Amino acid sequence: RPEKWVKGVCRYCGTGCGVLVGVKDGKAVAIQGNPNNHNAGLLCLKGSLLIPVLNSKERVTQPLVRRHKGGKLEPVSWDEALDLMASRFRSSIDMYGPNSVAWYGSGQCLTEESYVANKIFKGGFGTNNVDGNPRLCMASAVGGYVTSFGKDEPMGTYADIDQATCFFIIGSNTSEAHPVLFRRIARRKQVEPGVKIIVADPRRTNTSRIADMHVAFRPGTDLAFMHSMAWVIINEELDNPRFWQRYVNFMDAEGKPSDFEGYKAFLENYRPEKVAEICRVPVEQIYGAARAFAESAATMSLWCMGINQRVQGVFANNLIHNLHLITGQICRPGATSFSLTGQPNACGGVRDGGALSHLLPAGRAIPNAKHRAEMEKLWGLPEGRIAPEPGYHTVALFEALGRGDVKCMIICETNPAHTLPNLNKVHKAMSHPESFIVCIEAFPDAVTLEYADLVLPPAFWCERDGVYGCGERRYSLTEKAVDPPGQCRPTVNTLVEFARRAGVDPQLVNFRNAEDVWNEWRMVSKGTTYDFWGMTRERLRKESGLIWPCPSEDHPGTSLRYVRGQDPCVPADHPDRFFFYGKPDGRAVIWMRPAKGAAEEPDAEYPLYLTSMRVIDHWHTATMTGKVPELQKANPIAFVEINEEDAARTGIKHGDSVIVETRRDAMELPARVSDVCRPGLIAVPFFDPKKLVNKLFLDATDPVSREPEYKICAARVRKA
Ligand SMILES: Nc1nc2c(c(=O)[nH]1)N[C@H]1C(S)=C(S)[C@@H](COP(=O)(O)OP(=O)(O)OC[C@H]3O[C@@H](n4cnc5c(=O)[nH]c(N)nc54)[C@H](O)[C@@H]3O)O[C@H]1N2
Ligand SMILES: Nc1nc2c(c(=O)[nH]1)N[C@H]1C(S)=C(S)[C@@H](COP(=O)(O)OP(=O)(O)OC[C@H]3O[C@@H](n4cnc5c(=O)[nH]c(N)nc54)[C@H](O)[C@@H]3O)O[C@H]1N2
Ligand code: SF4
Ligand SMILES: [Mo]
């Protein structure tokens, strides 16, 4: 029975549910949803079963070191570990320059931890080799928002779910991936049965059971589909000229200035009857989706990896925004283009904090000299300290590691040997005989540890305080509830000490705790369109999150970005009601992106599309949810989804052990025959360690966002 309730944030998905941890003095005994956060006291099963994870004894509790490659990992002193880390890094820089070292973090790191590691590597060591797992996830969405709007992050919030009359949910298994959000959507349609829901996804998931229409298009053909929708919208005069004539600019297929007539001319290449067959769907779906979208009083789009993990990821994102831009379904309650963020802090930590290889904090960019100067000034650095060239993006980083270009790397709160694409190649790279890899990891079963040279024990989740920035621009504090076990220390501290010992000027890592970094980061944001200066620690302790922009302590936060009278970044006296200030002329942009396909399409030899997806019970690599026995009762191990019509003709029965094979590897999996995967598609989950499916997937990335195409590759199947 709890004596105190410590306010936090769920450790899992980007829905970012507020949580209250009940501690019976010393130990966490219960957990309940924070009634004051957006989730209003509700949590899904994974969140509900957080305590068994926090109290698990199967943790990394003391530093470990592997004296030599291929050898046993053994205990080592914290002091001996920090000196080892600092000497190896400093030497590498002294010998080969900053670009020989790198930081590979994640959207699961507290904002404060990502900010510190970013600053160390960029302002301290002078290398921009700072990336993270959000590159495997939200990079395409960032690209989409910056190219369409000139600023990252959604312009709306979760609250828009309550006023939308239409939901266009594409490339998102919302029920299994953002449970609390799916419930809020299902609730909306229950309160108002008139609400229409279109679910576009090659797979028929539980998300489609509340859908008015399920568009099961051929993998990769959604750009054609969405262009077709705009064709219909224009053709049936369902567009909003009063809006686009005043707030939109058009760009042709070659990226040059164009106009409405050019948009119409381009769209002629995407007529419904032609696209319906490209997409392998009934032509009525194109008309229906378009009409529901444009005729509705307020439409909201929501999408996830099915859109982002694509070589055309940034373009697919632009197409979704085009729909809202041509119809004016934006900047009003219930109407917005809402990218769903997968991780708890891919937003606050990596995106907003600029902890990616080409970024600087608060929407600054490495290639921009005024930005580099601005940062050198804020961080008290000597002119020119920040390298002008962006560092390696994730896939390139592990490639550099495999070549010996990157000799020292810190992997923190991610499991790359399990989750990076094209594993066989990645494993070879991580096995470089002369590399020095330091893993900050909470659970010993993470496969990446088999590659680590030094393992450091971190304080897990609420064992320390920190901020998480979820998908709706909401910044929420998680206060420390219990003490870290064994020798576990807060990564914020471990970083500050690693820096000092590595030679970094002490004025740079001038932090005792997370609150100290929050105050500097608060300063670094001041004046920018991210400005969250009003989010003091005290306000964050008392509030269940605040949504930025939040400039002064007396400012309530912002739900409607780009809207006069709502967004503080839009002059009180701006002449127009909307202002897309991320663009020089205040106008958003519609892009006539040509629809292509996957990097590796099916052919004679490998006739099927292979996709990979989430399952509600398991969180990623399962080093955390794998400790909760209840979560293992439905899908204990991996399987391969095969379509009914394909199985029959292929001669495969349900339960059969089948070999899924791509050009990169073959893996045996039990077949799960159903109508989930449309014909010509198979799907594998990645939660099982004994079945590392990323060994099957290709390594191609969107040339702009550099996000890998985990969603599509070519395969062949056979009975084992
Ligand atoms: N239980 C649980 N929840 C999670 C996670 C977890 O590990 N476990 N992860 C969190 C994280 S990091 C993230 S990024 C989110 C992501 O969550 P989602 O992206 O919603 O989950 P996925 O299974 O990857 O869903 C992608 C969907 O894209 C489909 N798809 C495949 N090919 C295409 C295509 O060509 N076009 C389109 N439009 N769709 C396509 C798939 O069939 C699948 O249904 O989930 C979050 N939620
Ligand atoms: N085929 C395929 N591959 C994919 C995807 C896909 O859809 N298909 N999705 C991709 C996407 S969106 C993502 S987000 C990535 C994510 O994939 P990863 O980030 O690699 O997966 P996680 O299991 O979340 O890794 C987090 C690690 O943090 C550890 N950890 C937990 N708490 C702490 C802590 O406090 N400190 C430290 N140091 N470690 C801690 C865990 O034990 C675990 O090893 O996977 C990607 N890979
Ligand atoms: S919906 Fe996401 S943030 Fe909310 S309790 Fe579930 S896993 Fe946690
Ligand atoms: Mo993600």
* Domain locations in the chain as residue ranges: 1-58, 59-136+343-559, 137-342+560-591, 607-720
Which token pair is 330? 């934006």
Give the CA angle between residues 320, 321, 324 to the nearest 5°.
Answer: 100
**679-711: string of b/e by CB count within 10 Å (b at 16+)?**
bbbbbbbbbbbebbbbbbbbbbbbebbbbbbbb
106 CB within 6 A, ligand 2: yes
d(CA 239, CA 257): 20
Handedness of CA 447, 450, 454, 457 (dihedral sign): positive
**Alpha-carbon separation of residue 315 from 66, 148, 259, 335, 665 (angstroms):** 44, 10, 19, 21, 30
**417-428: string of b/e by CB count within 10 Å (b at 16+)?**
bbbbbbbebbbe
Sheet holding 4-9, edge to edge: 4-9, 18-24, 27-33
Listed residue (715, 425, 678) closest to 598, CA to CA:
715
Q: Which helix (H) or strand (E) holds 704?
A: none
The CATH architecture annotation of domain 137-342+560-591 reads: 3-Layer(aba) Sandwich (3.40)
Q: What is the CATH number of domain 607-720?
A: 2.40.40.20
d(CA 139, CA 342): 12
Overall CATH class of domain 1-58: mainly beta
Which token pair is 623? 């080093």
In the reported structure, the alpha carbon of residue 206 is separated from the centroid of ligand 1 by a whole-number distance in angstroms of: 13
Q: Which helix (H) or strand (E) holds 392?
A: none
In the reported structure, the alpha carbon of residue 623 is separated from the centroid of ligand 3 by a whole-number distance in angstroms of: 17
Helix, strand or coil, per DSSP, at residue 634 = coil
| Amino acid, res. 472 | E
Helix, strand or coil, per DSSP, at residue 134 = helix
Overall CATH class of domain 59-136+343-559: alpha beta
Matching fold, domains 1-58 and 59-136+343-559: no
Pairing mode of beta strands 588-591, 657-662: unpaired
**28-48: string of b/e by CB count within 10 Å (b at 16+)?**
beebbbbeebbbeebbbebbb
Burial group, residue 666, by CB count within 10 angstroms (0-12, 13-18, 19+): middle
Listed residue (397, 473, 383) closest to 437, CA to CA:
397
d(CA 326, CA 410): 45
Chain centroid offset of residue 652 CA:
36
d(CA 411, CA 442): 12
Which token pair is 272? 């419904």
Dihedral, CA atoms, 393, 395, 397, 401, nearest 10 degrees?
180
438 CB within 6 A, ligand 3: no
> CA-based Rg of the chain, rounded to a whole angstrom?
25
d(CA 601, CA 623): 33
Asked whether the beta carbons of 639 and 656 are under 8 A apart, the reply is: no
Nearest CA to ligand 1 atom 40: 306
**Alpha-carbon separation of residue 247 from 244, 457, 588 (angstroms):** 5, 52, 6
* Main-chain dihedrals φ then ψ at residue 53, nearest 5 degrees: -75, -50
16 CB within 6 A, ligand 3: yes
Which token pair is 60? 């990394």
Chain centroid offset of residue 352 CA:
12
How many other β-carbons are positioned within 10 Å of the β-carbon of residue 713?
Answer: 28
Helix 283-295 to helix 272-279 angle, to the nearest 10 degrees? 110
DSSP annotation of 458 reads: B
d(CA 151, CA 600): 31
Note if 305 is an active site residue.
Answer: yes
Beta bridge partners of 129: none
* Closest ligand, as measured to the CA of 692: 2
44 CB within 6 A, ligand 3: yes
Helix, strand or coil, per DSSP, at residue 658 = strand
Q: Report the pocket of ligand 1 as residue ranges, CB < 6 Å.
A: 13, 137, 170-173, 176-178, 200-203, 205, 219-220, 222, 304-307, 342-343, 611, 613-614, 616, 618-620, 711-712
